[PDB]
Design a protein around this ligand. Sequence first.
Ligand SMILES: C[C@H]1C[C@@H](CO)C[C@@H](CN)C1
Ligand SMILES: C[C@H]1C[C@@H](CO)C[C@@H](CN)C1
Lengths: 546, 546
Amino acid sequence: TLRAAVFDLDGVLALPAVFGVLGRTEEALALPRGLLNDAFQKGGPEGATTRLMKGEITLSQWIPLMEENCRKCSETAKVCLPKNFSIKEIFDKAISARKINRPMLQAALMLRKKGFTTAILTNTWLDDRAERDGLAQLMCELKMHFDFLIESCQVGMVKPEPQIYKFLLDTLKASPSEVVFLDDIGANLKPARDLGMVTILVQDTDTALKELEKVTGIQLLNTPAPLPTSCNPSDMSHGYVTVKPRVRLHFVELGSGPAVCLCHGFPESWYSWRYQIPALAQAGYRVLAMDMKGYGESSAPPEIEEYCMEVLCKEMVTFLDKLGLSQAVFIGHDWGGMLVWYMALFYPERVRAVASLNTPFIPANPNMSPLESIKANPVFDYQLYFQEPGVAEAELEQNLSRTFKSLFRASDESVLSMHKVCEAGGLFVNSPEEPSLSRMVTEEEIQFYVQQFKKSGFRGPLNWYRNMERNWKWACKSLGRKILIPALMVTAEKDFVLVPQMSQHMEDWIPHLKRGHIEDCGHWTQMDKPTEVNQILIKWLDSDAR
Amino acid sequence: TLRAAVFDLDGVLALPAVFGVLGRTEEALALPRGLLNDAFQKGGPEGATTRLMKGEITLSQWIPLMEENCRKCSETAKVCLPKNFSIKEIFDKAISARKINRPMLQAALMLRKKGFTTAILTNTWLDDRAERDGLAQLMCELKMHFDFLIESCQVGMVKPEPQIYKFLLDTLKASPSEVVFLDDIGANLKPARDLGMVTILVQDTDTALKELEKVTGIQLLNTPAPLPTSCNPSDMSHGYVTVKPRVRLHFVELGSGPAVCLCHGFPESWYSWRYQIPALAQAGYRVLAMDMKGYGESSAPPEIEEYCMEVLCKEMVTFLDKLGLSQAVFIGHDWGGMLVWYMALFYPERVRAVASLNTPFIPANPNMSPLESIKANPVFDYQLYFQEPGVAEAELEQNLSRTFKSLFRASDESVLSMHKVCEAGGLFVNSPEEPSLSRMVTEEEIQFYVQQFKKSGFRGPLNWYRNMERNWKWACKSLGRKILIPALMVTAEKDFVLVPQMSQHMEDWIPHLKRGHIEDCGHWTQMDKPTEVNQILIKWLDSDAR
Ligand SMILES: C[C@H]1C[C@@H](CO)C[C@@H](CN)C1
Ligand SMILES: C[C@H]1C[C@@H](CO)C[C@@H](CN)C1
């Protein structure tokens, strides 16, 4: 009975294979056939390549030794290599061209999801080339999805030596019968099979995956599009900045490149960006996923005025100041989306670009009190219910698991009637005591929000809605301004509170505004349509925010 | 009696003045004299410039309005502006050219050090230009050194209106008699003087500073070279990464750009880099100042083996993995310097560049046990005293304040006889019970190390010295390798343990090695010679690690 899957890197998890380029280069340069491949193989277990693969020497020390035995191979073959000929150039290009074999990684992901222990077992080198970062990034993206990465150059052992195989079984804590091993080299497959391991010779991916699924009894080929990589809270770098004596801001941080500050809505968490964090980091950005004031590990002072837009925005400017960031791209959703437009209007020098999910930018009406405006829209009734301090806190804090289970639902799953929330007496009066689990969230994901909300409750979050008049007066100071920095408005088709229609006049105040639209998407945009969100944000970031 | 100093930005804390360019441009373009300056001034309190300065409109909305009144000014003057003429270009160049007036900032720093409340009061705009980041960075570097920054466009008030002055006194919580106000505009100086404020008209800096010192009674001109900006621990972004179930790593983080990982020595802290952190961040780098395993807010497991180089290096690789960093520049001192060379030998793909302060790279002698090698050097006797678990912990933990006061001393201040530490019975047997305070450290800085060491003590730190044999066996696997990535070796003239001479054969293993040398510098390199350290590291970073 299988419980572990092992994959080679070259020709298996990454394609095209690097050694296959030795053949390509000799065919392109009309050199004798295997000439370059024999030079690579020179000395076998005692040669330069084995010393390199065992970690005795680095790739840059190996380059001239490959060059010396490239001559020796051509000397006997009674030929001569050209004047342009460079091993460095050949390997630089080969390594750069080699990309992740996505269906192979997906199969490894599905196996790990079904309970398998997964590992990468590879014959590799210590890369000290000036271009080494390319491979560093690939190994980083790859390794994250596996329980173990075993590198020949780190363990001082090599395939096909039988010691690396015994090292593999020892690392896996499993007998050879419990293990599937995939390799593109028959010679490297042989010792694994010799111990009684299920072995797959990998030529084309599809056949290898058909063999993989037949042997494991798990569908790996033609399976539905998987969800983007999520975040395990305990595997993140957690950051904390004191913005004022009584206020500390918490954030999760991942990646390098331009700073991208993610701002969640009500009643959320940094975790609402779980599907965007690895994606944006992988796209070449430094992600800072906030716990907005009043939430999770961030401070939650009780005073209403502490949550007015002016104070919240000033604190986000201090947050940048204390981190030593002159700018950040600001991406917000719901209440975070509103803050993000206000950061753009009042602090354009600190905002590299601005993006909003669902939240439109609507200039304040100076000839109408905000309470009249909220009253004018039937869907905004819940906001009037949120005004009296203590009432909504009592209902929302009563049963946390029920609160998030009731709120976090797809467009085709609602249990919440937004109509006449005040007259009905509350948000969940028509909702079951034990709501069913939404298709968007696991029981584990609900419990993270439950645990987060046990710290400070709903007072701070609800206070974001309790500064309508203060926010309106502040917003009126910006009535003569336009948003002229790069901006993106993302609308969600089925958000019945933050309707796409509400964003239709935005080009009057943001003339160069770019857009994104998500069909069959409810209010909880990031978890509802994670793949589409990431596609829209990455495309916009690479074009307008770099 | 004065207790507050207020400075203008343009023509005072930053030079050359931006409006002075209106004159330069008309003189260069042979336009009528004041033509461009009158266009800027058009409408006075009701004009576009006042609307801009009060924050009613943004700089990009203002540009075409300045252009319209540039014509109106030339219409009456019976002239015509050329076809190349661009206000955007003129202001882009003017803002870019404007740099911090260093002696003015130094005077403000000295005043704040002597107990003054300091503030920047400026007539500025909301910058939404594509080039806005340049000014964002300048404001960021400037603001940090002041108690308050008052911007006309944020407060909706402007100089010379008397309301901004009353707002200033209210912000300062001081009467006009307690305040010095510096401005390059006589008209803007007038209302401050009208309230009874000491006023300085700023033309040339030196005269303004002579006036400043006469009026405050504090020497500001011709004063010694100040120390680089330090770190206040409570104003930093604190980061935490779990590298394995029982191990969490703490770090301080500042800036944007390539990641620079700072690794302290024994018995230190992230705080040992206090003078490098703001400097390196200001030079365009993302600084990550570690609490190395066993120190401060990082985990300190008791087991000796947890502190062998192999484990420590693997954990630093996991640290990069969890932060989403494919590489970092590694800069180490003392034990951190040793780790940093091992990161380069075993993980060259993860190290962008490597720099060491004091610690040389010496390949392991495979024909000599490490205990024989340590015995062969009289200065390394203290290391043999550190071998027996508990002994050095008892002496070092006995009185923490005495420990750091005894250790952290300049070359001309030693109280510690490194000769025969074992035979003498300990490190401090010849040391006073109440050592004098070194010129390198304040009493406050000693107490931070004292507070840090109260958490875990000296067991984990001393364990770094307790893996000689384990480290030697691991190092022998790298005996055939060379360090071929960018590298810097910084020697300290007066380090009597890590002597410059010990680094003389490094070019044999690191052929492209770059060097730095610090004269009259002891073991505590970073705090002993902070200015020189920063100069050497910044120059090397900008040339080899970018
Ligand atoms: C009570 C919730 C309902 C939610 C839409 O289901 C929107 C959210 C934030 N505006 C408030
Ligand atoms: C006991 C201290 C003395 C110090 C030099 O004063 C060096 C340090 C780390 N090698 C150990």
